Amino acid sequence: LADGHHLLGNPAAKLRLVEFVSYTCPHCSHFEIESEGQLKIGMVQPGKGAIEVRNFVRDPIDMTVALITNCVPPSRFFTLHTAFMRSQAQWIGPLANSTEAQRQRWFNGTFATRTRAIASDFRFYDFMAARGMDRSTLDRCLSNEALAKKLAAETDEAINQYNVSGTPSFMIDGILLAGTHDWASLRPQILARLNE
């Protein structure tokens, strides 16, 4: 699959759930905690369906996290993606707490300068060091502007083709699910399809 797309489970499974999610969205964090287990044991493990996670990148903080999760091998993506989502409350504090002068650096200057400022402010060096990724490996990841452009293009595809606006959003078998932005609304639609 293309950059910013990641597939969990069997590509030939009949039910394909696409998730448009963002690392800076509180609804996506809550959704991951609520849904990850049940989707795995109920659907993915028995080979009844597969999950395509798309990084819907909303802001440069999101972009910085998505550079990290997309720079690791496919077999590490899902653990890392889940970790950022599950531990969102632990790392996202500077979004609320930072001052004007700090915020200025996230939204101005070149891609490299702002990505480095964000990674510093959000303490991603320490977060990723605690997960085996050293500073040199993280530096290379954060400077991958080519990848940032591809993730931006993937995000633009979601916005343009599917009118994706709020997060998380979902499609099942090509249909974007109206009014469906949490596990409580999603699950009955998944079970209806599985149990047809």
Nearer to Cl ion, 30 or 150 (CB): 30
Site for Cl ion in 18-77 (CB under 5 A): 30-31, 34
End-to-end CA separation in angstroms for the chain: 28
Selected binder of Cl ion within 75, 160, 163, 195 (CB under 5 A): 160
Task: Please count the residues of this chain forming the interface with Cl ion, following the rule CB under 5 A.
Answer: 11
Give the nearer residue to Cl ion in terms of CB position, either 29 or 70: 29
Contact 22, 62 (CB under 8 A): yes
Alpha carbon 35 to chain centroid distance?
A: 14
Contacts of 27 (CB under 8 A, 6+ apart): 166, 167, 168, 181, 182
**Can you tell me which of 14, 45, 126, 165 binds Cl ion, judged by CB under 5 A?**
126
Tokens of 89: 């409350």
123 binds Cl ion (CB under 5 A): yes
Minimum CB–partner distance for residue 6 and Cl ion (Å): 19
> Measured between alpha carbons, how far is 194 from 188 in angstroms, rounded to an integer?
10
Nearest partner of 122 among 72, 87, 152, judged by Cα: 87
Distance of closest approach, residue 34 Cβ to Cl ion, in angstroms: 4
Q: Quick one: tokens of 95? A: 């979004």
Considering only the stretches 87-95, 107-115, 156-164, 188-196, report the one whose residues sit in contact with Cl ion under the rule CB under 5 A: 156-164
Q: Which two tokens stand for residue 22?
A: 């963002």
Nearer to Cl ion, 75 or 97 (CB): 97
Q: Which residues bind Cl ion (CB under 5 A)?
A: 30-31, 34, 123, 125-126, 157, 160-161, 182-183
